[PDB]
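Tip: read the tokens left to right.
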């Protein structure tokens, strides 16, 4: 209720009230910003990470791996400080593929070396932590390497580090995945990719994790419509009937969830089927923040 009804960017009094909101108890909002859709990357893009709503908790930098040096420069020099001004945390996402890369020794030294290399994606940009995207099962050697890397990262990020920086586990699999069973003690938040998913399933998936976390570490994710993308149908009209809305309102039985996240937050409000790039006032984000913290 200290959050703008449009996407205004507070400056003084209006700002401090948003900072103090974020310092206190709330269901948090996170969003994956597709780096290749930032105005500072290539051309033709309409949305910039500077547009992101003041009442957002975490912004994920999600590169595809071809983004121009302009974007990274902009991120370091411009976007991170501005987003830090609004009390918005900025977190680099990387695929689990990076943590099981066989170019890196499957040894203690190898795990540290790989962690150090991944920590440069955080430190070199003044980021608030690292998000590992886990969407695949692992063999015994891949598991051993990924676990080692998590344990090394845990010295600088997440609940074991004492730095206040985040180590985030984002996945479309459940809490029986061996990697989760090995690294759950290192994890700040666990974000469940729940695009197109039955509301009837949310408790079942949550139950798989609940013994390893508090409810406040758990987030569920819906997708915005990606240009030429999968039709998850998470953002159908009317809004207050959408899967996204149902996610904001959903609570595990007996407890309160940590919040929700959007994939492709740069596509906030673009209709399902509209494959053009457009600007956004982040209506859906700000509305869903309000629907969680009334
Ligand atoms: C091969 C492929 O397209 N994989 C994508 C993957 O790259 C996406 O990030 C992923 C995100 O969604 C999550 O995983 C799936 C498996 C479900 O469990 C979702 O509910 C999760 O949020 O999705 C993959 N794409 C698909 O699964 C699309 C699917 N084949 C379809 O056409 O409906």
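Filled-in amino acids:
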């Amino acid at each position: 209720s200290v959050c703008p009804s449009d996407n205004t960017h507070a400056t003084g009094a209006a700002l401090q009230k948003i900072l103090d909101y974020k310092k206190g108890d709330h269901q948090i909002m996170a969003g994956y910003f597709r780096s290749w859709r930032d105005t500072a990357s290539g051309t033709g893009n309409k949305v910039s990470m500077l547009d992101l709503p003041d009442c957002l908790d975490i912004a994920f930098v999600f590169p595809e791996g071809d983004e121009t040096a302009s974007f990274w420069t902009t991120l370091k020099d411009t976007y991170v400080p501005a987003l830090h001004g609004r009390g918005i945390k900025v977190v680099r996402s990387v695929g689990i593929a990076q943590l099981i890369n066989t170019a890196w020794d499957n040894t203690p030294a190898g795990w540290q070396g790989l962690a150090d290399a991944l920590m440069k994606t955080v430190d070199d940009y003044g980021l608030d932590g690292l998000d590992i995207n886990v969407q695949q099962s692992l063999n015994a050697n891949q598991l051993k390497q990924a676990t080692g890397v998590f344990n090394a990262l845990a010295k600088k990020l997440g609940p074991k580090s004492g730095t206040g920086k985040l180590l985030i586990f984002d996945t479309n699999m459940d809490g029986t995945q061996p990697l989760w069973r090995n690294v759950y003690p290192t994890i700040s938040y666990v974000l469940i990719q729940s695009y197109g998913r039955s509301i009837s399933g949310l408790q079942t998936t949550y139950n798989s994790f609940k013994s390893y976390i508090s409810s406040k570490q758990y987030l569920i994710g819906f997708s915005f419509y990606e240009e030429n993308g999968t039709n998850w149908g998470d953002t159908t009209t009317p809004m207050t009937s959408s899967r996204a809305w149902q996610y904001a309102k959903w609570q595990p039985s007996g407890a309160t969830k940590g919040g929700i996240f959007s994939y492709a937050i740069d596509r906030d409000g673009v209709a399902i089927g509209d494959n053009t790039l457009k600007t956004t006032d982040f209506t859906w984000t700000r509305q869903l923040i309000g629907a969680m913290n009334p």
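The pocket of ligand 1 is lined by residues 135, 172, 193-197, 230 (CB under 6 Å). Residues 234 and 244 are 6 Å apart (CA to CA).
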